[PDB]
């Protein structure tokens, strides 16, 4: 679904996290890469999904 | 064909090997008119010129006499538009073609996309930001005490706040930095709960540290709470570091995909922003970000080939639109003048010129006739301005004699065996500025005569002990950039050149470790922009050449903090004041559309 990039500011353990998550649709996070399934790609989506669920963002994340 | 004819231009040094090979590959076997037209286009693009209008290429009055070999080829068809567009090497912009011919100006697709991106961003995509006029007026009233007369600084703050993209134009010492502090203070005070992210940027790290200290002194003159002082920007970085320019490659970490994360951005000394960097900065900006540019219209970097700000402020002389003059009257609480006629609405409303500042009276008389110029340098002497008539060589030696007087304090500190840090600050007390690069008057001319005057007089014997040196090209490894100065002396560990880091720490560099260095006793007026000099001297040739221009002499006078001296002919200097730098860029032609 069409979506816009959002900016993230969070407080975790008194540490501020700043960054951008591109192409955030109202359903959730959607990423696609042309490679083999690996745990490095799952860990990459994991950190991106946790920072997505910490600020609003009700929904799933798929890769 | 014309190929072998173009091979002579390399020996004649009228064309670089890049221009000739680009002309053989792209134009190919087509008419020799198309081959040399891409040759002079690649040459002017190499020197920094944006485009190549067809009228300049046709007239025999143009340079590169290899052009006279065109009459034997083009056969005087008198149509450059019909010949060039017919070939596949030139198109109207529809096809993916290297060269583009549109408004009679021929130039590369690179310059075409950069001209289109810049001229559109100022004409389009910008939105008028509507805020409460009563509250915005109450804020500006508390910043500026005097409401009795029209304040140019009050209009500059109102225009920048009401418009997303804006430019504040003004000369050195006119209070530009103070107006920015009033703009940033009124910006943070406007939105209490909304996020305010401010960034300071400069093309050079030199003027960047000049921006941080000057903005710091001006901001502490105004009261703010702890939340406002928390949103105060920290420091400024180089525009290349802001965009994340890699030293090895040309790629940028931001570009179109990753926008800069910001609210407002202030770019100081926008005169050194060439068209490539302005076009690369526009695509990096998000849609919610307001950008403010700082600089002057008459600075030589604005009128130089490839510059943007020069043609932007050229329309500022017309004035504000009739409607904005009524809107700014309700904001500033004064009567704002309205410009006559309607040329470009979005561009004229986004510009502001600060006319309030011997240096100021002379520079203001430069734009006027020579009658006010000769009268200002003459009577009352202003104590900041002196004039020496230079014709015969006997006055040329006395020029070098007073040149030693300006370096008199500097030359002694070299021979007094001081520390490098104080001497770095000492070399900023005097500098020499010359129009031409070569000849009896010029960079190549003075450096030989000046160092010869250092042999005749025993002040310093000749890397020689106590020599000042400037860096010719940027270096990412050593942390030193073009336009920076250094002092070479023996601390007892060895002969090493020392530099002053923005953090205040001294950094020793071996003489063989510098990427590029040259004798800095005389500087090119373009290379000294952004630097400050307590005393300055201008060297102009007795010859009449178009190289000497108005914006060159302007940047020479504005390059001096307080003291200034001049050696020039009243006939040569005043006539050069009338002559102004000609810009070929098609930006001002698109604003008229």
DSSP 8-state class, residue B268: S
- Using the 3D structure, point to which of B325, B354, B383 is the last residue of a domain: B354
The closest of B22, B49, B46 to B36, measured between CA atoms, is B22
Last residue of a domain, one of B80, B108, B136: B108
CA distance B352 to B175: 14
Contact at 8 Å (CB) between B294 and B268? yes
Query: Is residue B158 within 8 Å of residue B140, measured between CB atoms?
Result: yes
Pair B104, B114 in one domain: no
- From the centroid of its chain, how far is CA B179? 20
User: Which runs of E-coded beta strand occur in B398-484?
Assistant: 430-434, 467-470
- Residue B46 annotated in ligand binding: no
DSSP, residue by residue, B311-362:
HHGGGGGT---HHHHHHHHHHHSS-----SS-S-HHHHHTEEEE----HHHH
Phi–psi pair at B128, nearest 5 degrees: -80, 120
Mutate to test the interface with A, among B244, B258, B284 (most CBs of A within 10 A): B258
Q: How many alpha carbons lie under 13 Å from residue B496 in its C-beta half-sphere? A: 13
User: Chain B residue closest to A20 (CA)?
Assistant: B258
Residues from chain B that touch A18, judged by Cβ atoms under 8 A, are 261
The strand pair at B236-238 and B198-202 is best described as parallel
Instruction: Confirm whether B587 is domain-assigned.
Output: no
Distance CA B22, CA B27 (A): 8
Domain end (from B79, B108, B137): B108
Q: Return the structure tokens found at A56.
A: 């609003």
Among chain A residues, the shortest Cα distance to B254 is held by: A20
Q: Does residue B342 have a known ligand-binding role? A: no
Q: What is the resolution of this structure in A?
A: 3.8
Strand order of the β-sheet with A4-12 is A4-12, A15-25, A28-30, A60-62
Q: What are phi and psi of A41, to 5 degrees?
A: -75, -35
Are B261 and A22 within 8 A, CB to CB? no
- Whether residue B127 lies within 8 A of chain A, CB to CB, comes out as no
* Residues from chain B contacting residue A20 (CB–CB below 8 Å): 258-259, 261
Tokens of B301: 């970097």
In a domain, B539, yes or no: yes
In sign, the C-alpha dihedral spanning B458, B459, B465, B470 is negative
Give the position of tokens 């006793």.
Answer: B521
- For residues B177 and B214, what is the distance between their CA atoms, to the nearest angstrom? 7
Measure B477 CA to nearest chain A CA, in Å.
28
SS3 B591: helix
Between A and B, how many CB-CB pairs are < 8 A? 7
Task: Report the C-alpha gap between B22 and B87 in whole angstroms.
Answer: 16
Assign A18 to helix, strand or coil.
Answer: strand
Domain identity same for B100 and B67: yes
Q: Report residue A7 as tokens.
A: 């900016």
CA distances from B415 to B60, B253, B269, B405, B407 (A): 55, 48, 36, 15, 12
> Considering CB atoms only, which of B258, B259, B261 is closest to A18?
B261
Experimental method: cryo-EM
Residue B297: Cβ-neighbour burial (10 angstroms; 0-12, 13-18, 19+): buried
**Across chain A, how many H-helices and E-strands are there?**
1, 4
Q: Are residues B241 and B371 in the same domain?
A: no
Do residues B203 and B273 touch, judged by C-beta distance below 8 A?
yes
Determine whether B423 is exposed, middle or buried from the number of CB atoms within 10 Å of its CB (0-12, 13-18, 19+).
buried
Q: What's the distance, CA B338 to chain centroid? A: 29
The alpha-carbon gap from A17 to the nearest alpha carbon of chain B, in Å, equals 13
- Cα gap A62→B284, rounded to integer Å: 28
Give the single-character DSSP code of B513: G
B255 interfaces chain A, CB cutoff of 8 Å: no
Same domain, B350 and B227: yes
Q: Encoding tokens for residue A60?
A: 């799933």
For chain A, after which residues does the C atom lie more than 2.5 Å from the next written residue's N, i.e. where is it broken? Answer: none
Beta bridge partner(s), residue B487: B468, B498
* Cβ pair B261:A7 closer than 8 A: yes
Whether B589 is in a domain gets the answer: no
Mutate to test the interface with B, among A7, A10, A17 (most CBs of B within 10 A): A7
The alpha carbon of residue A37 is apart from the nearest alpha carbon of chain B, in Å, by 25
The minimum CA-CA distance between B255 and chain A, rounded to whole Å, is 14
B244 is in an annotated binding site: no
Q: Is B172 annotated as a binding residue?
A: yes
Do B350 and B373 share a domain, yes or no?
A: no
Range of the structural domain that residue B48 is part of: 1-108
Counting the structural domains of chain B, the total is: 3
Beta bridge partners, B490, equal: B495
The answer to whether the CB atoms of A20 and B257 lie below 8 A apart is no
The nearest CA of chain B is from the CA of A30 a distance in Å of 16
B259 at interface of A, judged by CB pairs closer than 8 A? yes
CATH number of the domain residue B185 falls in? 3.40.50.300
| Chain A residues lying within 8 Å of B199, measured CB to CB | none
Task: For residues B337 and B351, give the distance between their C-alpha atoms in angstroms, rounded to a whole number.
Answer: 14
* Residue B51 · residue B106 · CB < 8 Å: yes
**Do both B94 and B168 map to the same domain?**
no
Rounded to whole angstroms, how far apart are CA atoms B88 and B464? 57
Is residue B5 situated within a structural domain?
yes
Contact assessment for residue B177 and residue B215, using Cβ atoms and an 8 Å cutoff:
yes
């Amino acid at each position: 679904q069409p979506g816009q990039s959002m900016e993230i500011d969070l407080a975790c353990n008194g540490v501020q996290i700043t960054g951008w998550l591109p192409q955030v649709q109202p359903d959730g996070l959607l990423r696609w890469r042309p490679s083999l399934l690996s745990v490095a790609q799952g860990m990459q989506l994991w950190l991106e999904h946790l920072v997505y669920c910490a600020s609003g963002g009700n929904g799933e994340s798929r890769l | 064909k014309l190929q072998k004819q173009l091979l002579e231009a390399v020996e004649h040094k009228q064309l670089r090997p890049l221009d000739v090979q680009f002309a053989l590959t792209v134009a190919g076997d087509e008419h020799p008119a198309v081959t040399l037209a891409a040759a002079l286009l690649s040459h002017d693009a190499g020197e920094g010129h944006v485009c190549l209008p067809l009228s300049r290429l046709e007239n025999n009055e143009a340079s590169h006499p290899l052009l006279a070999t065109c009459v034997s080829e083009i056969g005087e068809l008198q149509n450059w538009e019909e010949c060039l567009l017919a070939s596949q090497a030139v198109s109207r912009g529809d096809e993916p073609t290297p060269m583009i011919l549109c408004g009679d100006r021929l130039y590369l697709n690179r310059m075409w996309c950069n001209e289109r991106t810049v001229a559109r961003f100022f004409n389009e995509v910008n939105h008028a930001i509507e805020v409460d006029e009563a509250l915005l007026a109450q804020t500006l009233d508390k910043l500026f005490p005097v409401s009795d007369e029209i304040n140019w600084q009050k209009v500059a703050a109102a225009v920048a706040l009401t418009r997303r993209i804006s430019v504040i134009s003004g000369g050195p010492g006119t209070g530009k930095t103070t107006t920015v502090a009033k703009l940033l203070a009124a910006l943070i005070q406007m939105a209490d709960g909304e996020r305010c992210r401010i960034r300071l940027a400069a093309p050079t790290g030199k003027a960047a540290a000049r921006l941080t200290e000057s903005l710091g002194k001006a901001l502490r003159q105004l009261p703010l709470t702890d939340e406002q002082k928390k949103r105060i920007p920290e420091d400024a970085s180089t525009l290349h570091r802001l965009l994340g320019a890699q030293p090895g490659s040309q790629r940028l970490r931001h570009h179109a995909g990753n926008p800069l994360h910001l609210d407002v951005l202030v770019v100081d000394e926008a005169s050194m922003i060439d068209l490539p960097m302005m076009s690369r900065l526009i695509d990096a900006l998000p849609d919610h970000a307001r950008v403010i540019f700082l600089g002057d219209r008459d600075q030589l970097a604005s009128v130089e080939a490839g510059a943007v700000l020069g043609d932007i402020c050229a329309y500022a002389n017309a004035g504000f639109t009739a409607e904005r003059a009524r809107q700014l009257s309700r904001l500033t609480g004064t009567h704002v003048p309205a410009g006559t006629g309607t040329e470009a609405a979005s561009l004229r409303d986004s510009l502001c010129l600060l006319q309030k500042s011997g240096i100021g009276q002379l520079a203001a008389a430069i734009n006027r006739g020579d009658k006010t110029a000769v009268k200002t340098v003459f009577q009352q002497d202003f104590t900041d301005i002196e004039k020496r008539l230079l014709q015969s060589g006997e006055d040329y030696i006395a020029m070098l004699e007073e040149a030693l007087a300006g370096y008199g304090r500097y030359l002694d500190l070299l021979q007094a065996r001081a520390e490098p840090d104080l001497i770095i600050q000492a070399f900023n007390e005097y500098q020499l500025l010359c129009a031409l690069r070569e000849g009896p008057f010029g960079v190549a001319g003075l450096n030989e005569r000046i160092e010869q005057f250092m042999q005749q007089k025993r002040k310093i014997h000749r890397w020689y002990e106590g020599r000042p040196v400037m860096i010719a090209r940027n270096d990412s490894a050593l942390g030193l950039f073009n336009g920076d100065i250094g002092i070479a002396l023996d601390r007892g560990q060895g002969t090493r050149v020392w530099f002053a880091m923005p953090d205040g720490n001294i950094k020793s560099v071996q003489p063989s470790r510098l990427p590029e260095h040259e004798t800095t006793w005389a500087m090119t007026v373009h290379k000294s922009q952004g630097s400050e000099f307590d005393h300055a001297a201008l060297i102009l040739p007795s010859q009449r050449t178009p190289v000497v221009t108005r914006e060159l002499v302007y940047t020479a006078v504005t390059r001096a903090r307080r003291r200034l001296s001049l050696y020039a002919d009243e006939r040569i200097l005043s006539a050069a004041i009338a002559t102004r730098t000609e810009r070929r860029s098609g930006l001002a032609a698109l604003f008229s559309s």
